[PDB]
Amino acid sequence: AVLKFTTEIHPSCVTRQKVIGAGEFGEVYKGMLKEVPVAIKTLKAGYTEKQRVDFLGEAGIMGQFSHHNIIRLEGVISKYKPMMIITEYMENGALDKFLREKDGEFSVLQLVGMLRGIAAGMKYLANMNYVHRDLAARNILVNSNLVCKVSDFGLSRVLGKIPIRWTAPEAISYRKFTSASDVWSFGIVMWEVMTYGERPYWELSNHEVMKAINDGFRLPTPMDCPSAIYQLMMQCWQQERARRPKFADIVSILDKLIR
């Protein structure tokens, strides 16, 4: 794929209406663009140069993609303060928090549908030769129509701190990040979904998680999870990365459970 540069949006085109959260780099707003509803992420007052670079850099990576299950970037304001990233609006926010609120409410069919969309976004990303490295329910956003979309491309790169509980053993131990380590992470996301937003490995420390992983531990079947879905997450957690399904396999497997 050919590299894209980021669309610059004029400040007068953006209207912030309400605060909808606190971000890594500053406040997040709901507002309007041009008009269409958008999420508007701002860069905090007193930002450092590194923060500016990382803020706009993540947006640039997100902007490489055009897929229904990857957050759409409208553009950035980088020539004016406050600097902003403008994306599609996701009314229901982060997937982990959304499921905790809706604990036990969804059908298995609906949870599978949500996972199928996430897998489709990842299949697309993998085919574009990108590894995400930070795939986790907290980094997936949910819109009013229950569509789940991959967000948070800070660690993403073409094929420092890492999210240990979501990371494959070979990526933890040997710095080997591939689409197959993203598949491991997807398995963790499946577990987060089927548990309605339980924390992977509960309150074990990172060192304890690493030891558990190295000892062959796998997270247990979520309450009332169908065997076929638990087996799929177990397949995503094959110790040897070459033996995990590809995202194309995952999409096909989930598709067949949509009945």
Swiss-Prot record:
Residues 7-259 are annotated as: Mediates interaction with ARHGEF16 and ELMO2. ATP binds at I20, G21, A22, G23, E24, F25, G26, E27, V28, K41. Changing D134N: Increases serum-induced chemotaxis. Loss of EFNA1-dependent regulation of cell migration. Residues 14-258 form the Protein kinase domain. Expressed in brain and glioma tissue and glioma cell lines (at protein level). Expressed most highly in tissues that contain a high proportion of epithelial cells, e.g. skin, intestine, lung, and ovary. The modification Phosphothreonine is found at T42. Autophosphorylates. Phosphorylated on tyrosine upon binding and activation by EFNA1. These phosphorylated residues are critical for recruitment of VAV2 and VAV3 and PI3-kinase p85 subunit which transduce downstream signaling to activate RAC1 GTPase and cell migration. Induction: Up-regulated by UV irradiation via a TP53-independent, MAPK-dependent mechanism. The active site is at D134. It is found in: Cell membrane; Cell projection, Ruffle membrane; Cell projection, Lamellipodium membrane; Cell junction, Focal adhesion. Changing R116Q: In CTRCT6; retained in the cytoplasm and constitutively active it alters EPHA2 signaling. The modification Phosphoserine is found at S252. Residues 1-259 are cytoplasmic. Changing G160S: In a gastric adenocarcinoma sample; somatic mutation. The modification Phosphotyrosine is found at Y29, Y130. Receptor tyrosine kinase which binds promiscuously membrane-bound ephrin-A family ligands residing on adjacent cells, leading to contact-dependent bidirectional signaling into neighboring cells. The signaling pathway downstream of the receptor is referred to as forward signaling while the signaling pathway downstream of the ephrin ligand is referred to as reverse signaling. Activated by the ligand ephrin-A1/EFNA1 regulates migration, integrin-mediated adhesion, proliferation and differentiation of cells. (Microbial infection) Acts as a receptor for hepatitis C virus (HCV) in hepatocytes and facilitates its cell entry. Mediates HCV entry by promoting the formation of the CD81-CLDN1 receptor complexes that are essential for HCV entry and by enhancing membrane fusion of cells expressing HCV envelope glycoproteins. Belongs to the protein kinase superfamily. Tyr protein kinase family. Ephrin receptor subfamily. Homodimer. Interacts with SLA. Interacts (phosphorylated form) with VAV2, VAV3 and PI3-kinase p85 subunit (PIK3R1, PIK3R2 or PIK3R3); critical for the EFNA1-induced activation of RAC1 which stimulates cell migration. Interacts with INPPL1; regulates activated EPHA2 endocytosis and degradation. Interacts (inactivated form) with PTK2/FAK1 and interacts (EFNA1 ligand-activated form) with PTPN11; regulates integrin-mediated adhesion. Interacts with ARHGEF16, DOCK4 and ELMO2; mediates ligand-independent activation of RAC1 which stimulates cell migration. (Microbial infection) Interacts with human herpes virus 8/HHV-8 glycoprotein L/gL and glycoprotein H/gH heterodimer; this interaction triggers EPHA2 phosphorylation and endocytosis, allowing virus entry. It is linked to Cataract 6, multiple types: An opacification of the crystalline lens of the eye that frequently results in visual impairment or blindness. Opacities vary in morphology, are often confined to a portion of the lens, and may be static or progressive. CTRCT6 includes posterior polar and age-related cortical cataracts, among others. Posterior polar cataract is a subcapsular opacity, usually disk-shaped, located at the back of the lens. Age-related cortical cataract is a developmental punctate opacity restricted to the cortex. Overexpressed in several cancer types and promotes malignancy. This is Ephrin type-A receptor 2. The gene is EPHA2.
